[PDB]
Ligand binder design. Structure first.
Ligand SMILES: OC[C@H]1O[C@@](CO)(OC[C@@]2(O[C@H]3O[C@H](CO)[C@@H](O)[C@H](O)[C@H]3O)O[C@H](CO)[C@@H](O)[C@@H]2O)[C@@H](O)[C@@H]1O
Ligand SMILES: OC[C@H]1O[C@@](CO)(OC[C@@]2(O[C@H]3O[C@H](CO)[C@@H](O)[C@H](O)[C@H]3O)O[C@H](CO)[C@@H](O)[C@@H]2O)[C@@H](O)[C@@H]1O
Ligand SMILES: [Ca+2]
Ligand SMILES: [Ca+2]
Ligand SMILES: [Ca+2]
Ligand SMILES: [Ca+2]
Lengths: 491, 491
């Protein structure tokens, strides 16, 4: 009858998730009422507080936990193994894992157990994966045209173009309101790290790529990365960087984007920032000063190990497992991921075709894709397989488009045969890595920021590398190299 | 004979705590060898990692956990109550708690147990507490004298003075190397929030004061606070602020301070930043534009609830309790807190007068006090009572000095009769407060930095306050108000 789930949702979505049409239909379909503890900001901290305080729900929905957390909770008995529950009570999920046993391998821990229910979304594979590049660079072609400038081909062209943006008044309003270059610094889709590949090798949110000699390379200690920092520093020194880039947030970023104040900026999809217009387009991959022309691959993929865990206080394992398996029904997975049909007081992502019992995406008509999706999606455990497109649902227009942009612009320069595989380390190695990352992760971005605002990377670089080593960088690399080699060896 | 303790220490101190002279003597005296897990950066993250993974020591030394963490560990049985241990095995601590019963109340959770062993240090009381002000403002008096300027007495004087620092080349090298105004943004001793009181009410690291009407006031939604942000924004607009003030760190901060580049800066004690010299002095309390002249009280005090917890895996509670009780011996408490004597090669904070069997502070002769302290102190649970001064130990000279500065400059303008008492809330209230602070704490500083670097506080202020309310601010204050009323109803 009733289950208590903790969940994570967008602050744009309703405070009570049961107000969402998907979940209203679901309750009428399953006969299960969910009482939600719905965290719309700082989910992970508030979740951890719940776990540390012993105030556990029946399950944690849309969880997104790290492997070290996943394993610590399992060893402590906070969550339970679920492989028997899958085999007994979950025919939708069992069909997917049995059809595609590699996903089943991705879910299994070193101890042979499965502890969580994944998100699977098949959009491209290998270099052509939609996740291959997250922080795409976009440029205002309209300003290029007004200033009579060609699309820049080199990093030196980019500097000249940004100077024209800063001083040439391309909007025509007689004010220096143009922001030549902007980003949200850190991890994620709005960072500038995409341009570091123009100096060779590049960078990603893991700071980790895989060389064609099969060696894992920590990127944030490469000379090429030092050179990428000096280039951004050059833009800062020339007054080309958004004066707010190191303090502003998403809301401010898109407000300037909507007003079309950006010359060059970074995001996943321009339609979320500068909108549905032809004024902005992909910045083509640039050659560096020595002719480097490269795109570093992320280690992202259409798979997330944990979008649901079941706690040890859960009162009705069979009911819970069956509820979760309804989320892996194809029509349900598609909707939970992307939105739904037939709302009367809200725009709809889908229309339902009753004749074929299938979903068809509707045109967004200017609405930001991320905005409507986060209002109406549900998140959580689900699977979208390649065989579903054209049968269960259409492929989203924005997904089709981005896949093609990655093919056209980036794949020709993704010269690393491999990226880092999604491995599931032992608790012992997870713990060691977690201790190291507790020092390293913030430190890297802090130093990066300080070097762009000041300009002392030349005198601080070697000390920085020694700090990383003290934090345990070469043990870090050894562990990652170890799992890479194991992954290759058993392929 | 052997116990495993986790501890936190300065990165200036030896990696193995047993290299410290205090602990080498402690081992001879107690016959107990401690095997240390010593974290010198990110102690709390790495401690939490150890707890989450079940890698528990016998005890956590110098722990400093928040109340919510304490009660959560207690409820889940990570740590044990210790009141029976105190009664059965700890005559020094028992002697302290009976001569000073208010600390016993401060150690006791609402469920009637004691869960940790405190740090106690008596240096002033009430408004004269050495903790009443943490981020004191300091000003280069040499520059005032070279420029023929009077000490500023208003916020409008301060701007004029800072402008004279920026342009007037008061260090006389013909270059604009003077940094008029600098700080390390956030909580703690180097932040600038001390100046917000010149606009009435002011601010502290809790963003919480207590009005003379007995009502708790959240400071960061007051118009006074908005005016304080607008003042710092004016200094940013006039190019008066350190260009890396929101990027740099303590080491960079004190490197610039050692070079005497600062006009006005913030720290606990100038001897740690600009050194032991008369070039710098207290910045007197400033009158604001409307005549506001105020010092906001912090809620700090000479008491920390948890500098040691005992874990549920601890094998030898009697041995542990007696070892902890040795730390509460008066001569041992003083040394664990402040440093030691008799090191024939290294500098010493103390000499041991063996006739009187008491400690006397030594002149450091240029050495910053905090630097020798963090190399040779031990931390952990300890008590220094006011009755010890003149009997067990000298009062530190830099402490007497800071205390005199607080009386002379700040106490006349600390017009709040109360600050917020150190209450021990229920676990249910602790956990509710911690959910709200997960949202508010970072938000408050992020918006403040943003507003100083852009200039849009006036158009974002109301949305900012609605956001604070969405995060639960009124619930936050009602809880804080309940405990304050309950406190006053009991004294
Ligand atoms: O390019 C569209 C295509 O990309 C995918 C990749 O999985 O969506 C990811 C994308 O969505 C994420 O962010 C939104 C908004 O926060 C969130 O609602 C969603 O759950 C996320 O997966 O990220 C951008 C911007 O964040 C969104 O525009 C986009 O939906 C894929 O699902 C989609 O078809
Ligand atoms: O003013 C001297 C007087 O202040 C006290 C207050 O408790 O010390 C606080 C003070 O110590 C802290 O910081 C040092 C160095 O990081 C650390 O070793 C120590 O354990 C901390 O309590 O903080 C400043 C610097 O922040 C130090 O100069 C000073 O020691 C008191 O103990 C001392 O007598
Ligand atoms: Ca313009
Ligand atoms: Ca490297
Ligand atoms: Ca000068
Ligand atoms: Ca208020």
């Amino acid at each position: 009858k009733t289950l208590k789930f903790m969940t994570a949702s967008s602050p744009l979505s309703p405070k009570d998730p049961n107000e969402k049409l998907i979940l209203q239909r679901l309750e009428k379909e399953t006969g299960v009422h969910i009482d939600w503890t719905n965290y719309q900001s700082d989910f992970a901290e508030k979740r951890n507080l719940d776990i540390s305080s012993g105030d556990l729900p029946d399950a944690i929905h849309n969880d997104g936990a790290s492997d070290v957390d996943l394993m610590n909770w399992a060893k402590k008995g906070v969550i339970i193994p679920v492989e028997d529950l899958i085999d007994k009570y979950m025919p939708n999920l069992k069909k997917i894992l049995d059809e595609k046993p590699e996903y089943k391998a991705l879910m299994t821990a070193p101890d042979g157990h499965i502890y969580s229910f994944p998100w699977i979304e098949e959009l491209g594979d290998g270099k052509e994966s939609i996740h291959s590049v997250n922080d795409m660079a976009w440029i205002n072609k309209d300003w290029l045209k007004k200033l009579g400038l060609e699309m820049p081909k080199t990093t030196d062209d980019l500097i000249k173009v940004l100077e024209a943006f800063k001083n040439g008044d391309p909007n025509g309003n007689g004010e220096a309101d143009e922001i030549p270059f902007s980003f949200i610094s850190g991890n994620g889709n709005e960072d500038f790290k995409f341009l570091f590949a123009a100096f060779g090798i590049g960078d990603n949110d893991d700071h980790l790529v895989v060389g064609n000699d099969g060696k894992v390379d920590f990127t944030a200690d490469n000379d090429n990365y030092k050179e990428g920092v000096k280039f951004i520093r050059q833009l800062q020194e020339k007054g080309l960087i958004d004066k707010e880039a190191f303090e502003h947030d998403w809301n401010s970023y898109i407000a300037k984007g909507h007003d079309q104040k950006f010359g060059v900026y970074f995001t996943w999809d321009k339609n979320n920032v500068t909108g549905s217009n032809e004024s902005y387009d992909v910045l083509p991959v640039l050659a560096g000063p020595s002719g480097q022309k490269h795109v570093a691959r992320t280690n992202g993929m259409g798979f997330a190990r944990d979008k649901m865990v079941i706690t040890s206080v859960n009162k009705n394992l069979e009911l819970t497992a069956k509820w979760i398996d309804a989320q892996y029904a194809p029509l349900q997975s598609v909707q939970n991921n992307w939105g739904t049909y037939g709302d009367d007081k809200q725009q709809n992502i889908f229309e339902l075709d009753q004749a074929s019992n299938s979903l068809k995406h509707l045109p967004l008509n200017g609405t930001a894709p991320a905005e409507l999706r986060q209002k109406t999606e549900v998140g959580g455990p689900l699977a979208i397989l390649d065989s579903y497109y054209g049968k269960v649902t259409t492929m989203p227009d924005d997904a089709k488009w981005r896949l093609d942009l990655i093919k056209e612009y980036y794949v020709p320069y993704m010269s690393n045969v491999n990226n880092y595989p999604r491995v599931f380390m032992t608790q012992e190695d997870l713990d060691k890595i977690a201790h190291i990352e507790a020092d390293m992760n913030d430190y890297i971005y802090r130093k990066r920021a300080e070097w762009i605002v000041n300009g002392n990377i030349d005198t601080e670089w070697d000390d920085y590398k020694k700090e990383l080593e003290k934090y345990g960088l070469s043990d870090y690399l050894a562990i990652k190299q170890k799992y890479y080699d194991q992954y290759q060896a058993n392929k």
